[PDB]
Design a protein around this nucleic acid. Structure first.
Ligand SMILES: *P(=O)(O)OC[C@@H]1CC[C@H](n2ccc(N)nc2=O)O1
Ligand SMILES: *O[C@H]1CCO[C@@H]1COP(*)(=O)O
Ligand SMILES: [Ca+2]
Ligand SMILES: [Ca+2]
Length: 903
DNA sequence: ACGGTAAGCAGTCCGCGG
DNA sequence: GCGGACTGCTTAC
């Protein structure tokens, strides 16, 4: 096994590094690192080193890191470039590890913890930590154990020991239903006072110190709470022992009337799961409680308990510890599914950065390009300052809102990284500029070729074709990796189901799994000898091809993530390599590209069909276009169309054998027109959509920009046995529209696309009649609640207050007094409802925290003055009206043909 | 501090008004 | 008094 780093930090002139060594042991070393930076120099005095612009550079070596920083400061105050890596950690890692780091994650301590704090007044603020910590569960990946510390005596009660035996037992008999596979894994530890508990915990931490610290909301609550709790009782020095180097920073807080803040524990790497999830789920949640994320991710229910949680330790201690145990486990279950931690680790070791820097695409990419440039003795630019000037982006086809019966979309492959490569965009490849004509003029091939010699973008930028550019080179390196490991992940399943069918063959002679690598596709040398194997080494030949299928997935996905994260880096002013003109160059080119192929598609289908200037491209957004395929269908007619599968075949055959070639011909001209280095605009078909054959369904409708629905039968050649609704943007896609309403509109949209107007009407008629029976939560609205405390004027609202904040502050005024009632948290979400006329509240609406049931004390009331008539019209009818107006349908008989006008 | 474009909504504004 | 414009905040592609 080879060496790799665990964590790294700069403290003064020292780098403090934790690492795994030659033999698998973790260690700490302090290195009084001597860094290098670079300055320009005469031609003559040329070295081995050059900047990316190809300019000769003198290497300066510094006694310490402070001296380096003092030099950058001196060079600034002069006005000369100070080149090289100014994050000396990235330089430390780059020097210490010149090679593909290969981590073994079983050697990395990843801690998973949660704490409980009984608090009879407010939510317990972690910056004051004024209430005792009465339970901690701490799971340790090296040990594979849940370490439970349980306070038995506290100001808020004395309670007997938790029992594991009772905890393992079922729901229906006073048991907790702590799952069977972890029960044998819990190390229970009771305490008669809080100082003893905290002291033992600090000791534990000393000997089992996390490299990677995770959990749920652990960064904004748990870590600062224990830190501050310990600090408040023991002193700063004691609480510093949470850091393996006894250094912490307490970062400048956000105050208005509360008081809250984040602690940095040097030498630990904190990935809060709530943050890994908000980064890597790409699905927006109505609430962000662990409670609500589990029922979503894992399909495990409520975490039941009679009575409020502040009386939970007192009333039911046994379930209290158990729930804190299940809390830790539930993260661990999500990470088994999601593999977010391993993703982060895989990213961070590829880039050679602190694992916690995966939350930054700028730092990840900075590091990747730095390593790549170093290994060729090149020198990175001084990261300069730039004014946050807004450039223009992807303009969007404004669609005629309407029904659209037959639709097939096509998609540009990784548009933006493809553009950088094709045009060869990079700081140092800028060649000059040209007279730019209006964009329509390029899109239309009217303006003259921008250049015979350089590679151009319609914003005016020219680039060298003869170089090939720091940035394009780097993306290309990653694309080819993303295709390398795709042959080692989709080949790790070729090794699985081929050992999965050899499992028929059992055992009669002792064996051990064969020594040939999984990063290759097997042949015939071991073909009849994976058969004559035993059925115990067949189980071990399934540990490994499954552990490349995951690593090959996790690594490649990390490349896909790397590829799409770049543009964001490139357009961001803090990026070493940003350049406004290049960014604009990228977008402006995309926009051209997308409208170019628009005109190319419309030109083509008009010649094929025998027709002049009729629109086929009904919409376009950034990388896709959506073509109306009605006239393609109607050029054969419903007939000799056997069944639904028959016309979809037709459209699949048509796009692949005819359209796609013309698109290709179209983009090649565009390449020649702009004289790009390389043609990389690869547009092939995405979705095929329409109504079931022989039906009254409408297949699709657009409402406006970014708001549409399609009945899809095929996605990239994967034909569905049942049609999939591709709704993009409508209320059923929104986190703020109620659930029961999210359902109804989906069923409405389904009925429109697949069945009659008759069936839409039958359903609308019924959802109305059954509305009052619905669950008050399933029919409540949702919004983020930002700046509550701006419109908050003596309990009431002042000038310009939103609806959602109105609700927040008629709540604040209803619960004024009752402490065991949740107070809306600013930045978090709120569930909203409307109240009617002479209500006992004061204003029109009421909003309470999302995820939750409203305090018992007003829940019964709010189920009397609830405005369902306004709530039905607001959340259901208004949006339905939108769809049907667009689709040219009615949801109700008797509807007038006039209106939809103005007279 | 670690990309633009655009929706739909509820509040208010603005100019034009017996 | 009137209704379209513009603002402010969400949350979408
Ligand atoms: P839509 O009709 O699904 O098309 C999606 C396109 C792709 C780029 C652009 N987009 C989507 C999502 C985010 N977050 N940012 C974007 O620019 O819309
Ligand atoms: O514009 C920002 C937000 C999304 O892309 C960039 C990310 O840069 P940073 O490294 O978070
Ligand atoms: Ca798309
Ligand atoms: Ca594709």
């Amino acid at each position: 096994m080879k060496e790799f780093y665990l964590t790294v930090e700069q403290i003064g002139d020292s780098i403090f590094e934790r690492y795994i060594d030659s033999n698998g042991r973790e260690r700490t070393r302090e290195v009084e690192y001597k860094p290098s930076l670079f300055a320009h120099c005469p031609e003559s005095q040329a070295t081995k080193y050059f900047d990316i612009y190809g300019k000769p550079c003198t290497r300066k070596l510094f006694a310490n890191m402070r001296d380096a920083s003092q030099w950058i400061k001196r060079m600034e105050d002069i006005g000369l470039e100070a080149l090289g890596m100014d994050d000396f950690k990235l330089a430390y890692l780059s020097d210490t590890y010149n090679y593909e780091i290969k981590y073994d994650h079983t050697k990395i301590r990843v801690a998973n913890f949660d704490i409980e704090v009984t608090s009879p007044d407010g939510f317990p603020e972690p910056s004051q930590a004024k209430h005792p910590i009465d339970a901690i569960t701490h799971y340790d990946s090296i040990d594979d154990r849940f370490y439970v510390f349980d306070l038995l005596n506290s100001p808020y009660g004395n309670v007997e020991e938790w029992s594991i035996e009772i905890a393992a037992k079922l729901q229906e008999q006073g048991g907790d239903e702590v799952p069977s596979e972890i029960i044998d894994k819990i190390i229970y530890m009771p305490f008669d006072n809080e100082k003893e508990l905290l002291m033992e915990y600090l000791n534990f931490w000393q000997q089992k110190t996390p490299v990677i610290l995770t959990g749920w909301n652990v960064e904004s609550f748990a870590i600062p709470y224990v830190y501050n709790r310990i600090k408040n009782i023991f002193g700063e020095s004691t609480a510093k022992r949470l850091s393996p180097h006894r250094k912490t920073r307490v970062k400048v807080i956000e105050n208005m009337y509360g008081s809250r803040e984040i602690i940095t524990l040097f030498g630990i790497s904190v990935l809060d799961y709530i943050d890994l999830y908000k980064k890597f789920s790409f699905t927006n949640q109505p609430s962000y409680s662990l409670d609500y994320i589990s029922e979503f991710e894992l399909n495990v229910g409520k975490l039941k308990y009679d009575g409020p949680i502040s009386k939970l330790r007192e009333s039911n201690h046994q379930r209290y510890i158990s729930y804190n145990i299940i809390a830790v486990y539930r993260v661990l279950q999500i990470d088994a599914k999601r593999q977010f931690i391993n993703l982060s680790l895989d990213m961070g070791y590829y880039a050679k950065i602190q694992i916690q820097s995966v939350f930054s695409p700028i730092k990840t990419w900075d590091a990747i390009i730095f390593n790549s440039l170093k290994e060729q003795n090149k020198v990175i630019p001084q990261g300069r300052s730039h004014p946050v000037q807004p450039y223009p982006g992807a303009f969007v086809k404004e669609p005629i809102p309407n029904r659209y019966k037959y639709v097939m979309s096509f998609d540009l492959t990784s548009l933006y990284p493809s553009i950088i490569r094709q045009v060869n965009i990079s700081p140092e490849t800028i060649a000059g500029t040209f007279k730019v004509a209006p964009l329509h003029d390029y899109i239309n091939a009217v303006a003259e070729r921008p250049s015979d010699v350089y590679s151009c973008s319609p914003n005016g930028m020219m680039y060298y074709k003869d170089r090939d550019g720091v940035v394009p080179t780097e993306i290309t390196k990653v694309f080819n990796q993303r295709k390398e490991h795709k042959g080692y992940m989709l080949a790790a399943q070729r090794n699985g189901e081929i050992i999965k069918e050899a499992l028929h063959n059992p055992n009669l002679s002792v064996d051990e799994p064969l020594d040939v690598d999984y990063r290759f596709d097997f042949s015939d040398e071991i073909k009849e000898k994976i058969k004559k194997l035993s059925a115990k080494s067949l189980n071990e030949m399934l540990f490994r091809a499954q552990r490349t299928e995951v690593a090959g997935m996790t690594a490649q996905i990390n490349r896909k993530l790397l590829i799409n994260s770049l543009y964001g880096a490139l357009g961001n002013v803090w990026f070493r390599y940003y350049d406004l003109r290049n960014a604009t160059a990228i977008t402006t080119f995309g926009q051209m590209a997308l409208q170019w192929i628009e005109r190319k598609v419309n030109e083509y289908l008009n010649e094929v069909c025998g027709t002049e200037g009729e629109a086929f491209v009904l919409y376009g957004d950034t990388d896709s276009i959506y073509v109306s395929a009605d006239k393609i269908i109607d050029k054969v007619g419903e007939s000799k169309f056997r069944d639904t599968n028959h016309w979809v075949d037709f459209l699949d055959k048509f796009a692949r054998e005819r359209m796609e070639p013309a698109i290709d011909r179209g983009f090649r001209e565009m390449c020649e027109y702009m004289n790009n280095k390389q043609h990389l605009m690869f547009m092939d078909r995405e979705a095929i959509a329409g109504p079931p054959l022989g039906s009254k369904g409408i297949g699709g409708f657009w409402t406006g920009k970014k708001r549409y629905a399609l009945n899809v039968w095929d996605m990239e050649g994967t034909r569905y046995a049942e049609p999939k609704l591709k709704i993009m943007g409508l209320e059923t896609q929104k986190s703020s529209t109620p659930k029961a309403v999210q359902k109804a509109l989906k069923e409405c949209i389904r009925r429109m696309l697949q069945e009659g107007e008759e069936s839409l009407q039958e359903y609308f008629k019924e959802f109305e009649k059954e509305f009052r029976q619905l669950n008050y939560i399933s029919i409540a609205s949702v919004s983020s609640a930002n700046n509550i405390a701006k419109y908050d004027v003596g309990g009431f609202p002042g000038p310009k207050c939103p609806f959602h904040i109105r609700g927040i502050l008629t709540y604040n005024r209803a619960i004024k007094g009752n402490i065991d009632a949740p107070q809306v948290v600013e930045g978090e979400k709120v569930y909203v409802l409307p109240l009617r006329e002479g209500n006992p509240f004061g204003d029109k609406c009421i909003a309470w925290p999302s995820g939750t049931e409203i305090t018992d004390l007003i829940k019964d009331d709010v189920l009397h003055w609830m405005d369902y008539t306004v709530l039905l019209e607001k959340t259901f009818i208004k949006p339905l009206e939108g769809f049907t107006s667009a689709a040219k349908l009615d949801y109700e008989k008797k509807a007038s043909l006039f209106d939809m006008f103005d007279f």
